[PDB]
């Protein structure tokens, strides 16, 4: 389950992903993917960046350091 | 015929069938409760009686 969310970050590729857009293709258990990203934050792969777009939403992206304006 | 049957048997036998057979065939159709958070805390109903 932790590998398909890697490709979905790679589906975003450059900007990042919001956590309820995960359910557009996954629609898995809402709490299993809730605590998976907390351990994935502890995995030191993904990070919680803030939205260049409309704010106040949890944007996650791997260590690319690549936002826009 | 009417001695051991009666005239309200179509109400009485059906309700006796429900509380003696069909209560089991409802519990067995959905026996288990599956907790999605921590999929180990299950809950199942063994049988039923009124």
């Amino acid at each position: 389950e932790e590998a398909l969310v890697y490709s979905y970050i790679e589906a975003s590729g450059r900007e990042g992903i919001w956590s309820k857009t995960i359910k557009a293709r996954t629609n898995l258990h809402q709490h299993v993917v809730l605590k998976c990203l907390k351990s994935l934050e502890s995995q030191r792969y993904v990070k919680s960046v803030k939205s260049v777009k409309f704010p106040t939403r949890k944007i996650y992206m791997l260590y690319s350091l690549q936002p826009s304006v | 015929f009417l001695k051991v049957k009666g005239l309200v048997k179509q109400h009485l036998d059906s309700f006796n069938y429900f509380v003696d057979t069909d209560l089991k065939k409802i519990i067995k159709a959905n026996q288990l409760i599956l907790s999605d958070v921590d999929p180990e805390f299950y809950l199942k109903y063994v049988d039923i009686r009124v």
Binding site: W18, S19, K20, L34, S48, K50, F54, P55, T56, R57, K58 | -
Partner: protein, 142 residues
Amino acid sequence: ELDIERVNQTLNFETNDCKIVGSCDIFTTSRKIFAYLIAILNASYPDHDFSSVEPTDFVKTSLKTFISKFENTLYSLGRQPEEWVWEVINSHMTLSDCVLFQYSPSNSFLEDEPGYLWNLIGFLYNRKRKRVAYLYLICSRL
């Protein structure tokens, strides 16, 4: 509990082309309280950060003024609001001697949710019991 389940069965319904989903909850888990409510907001909606908007619009209004239009909107939605609810939320929390807060900023975080119509979010801080109720009503459209 059972009475909390009843007052939550009150606040979740749907009429012809509107769907209102809201509830109340009470749990123990003005400078220090600014972080104490954004955790409630984060746990209430685990897809938006609420550490961002720190100097928000907490309109520290009277609770009687709040329950006034909170009752008026239940008249306005064909509900005929049942009075025992306001004792039940009293009976767990001692509604009289407590202060009310309200997250109502300029642009709330539900305007981007499709089908959003309006909200009514109530915080009720308690001091002696530390019992904060998160009374929220989200009217949507489907």
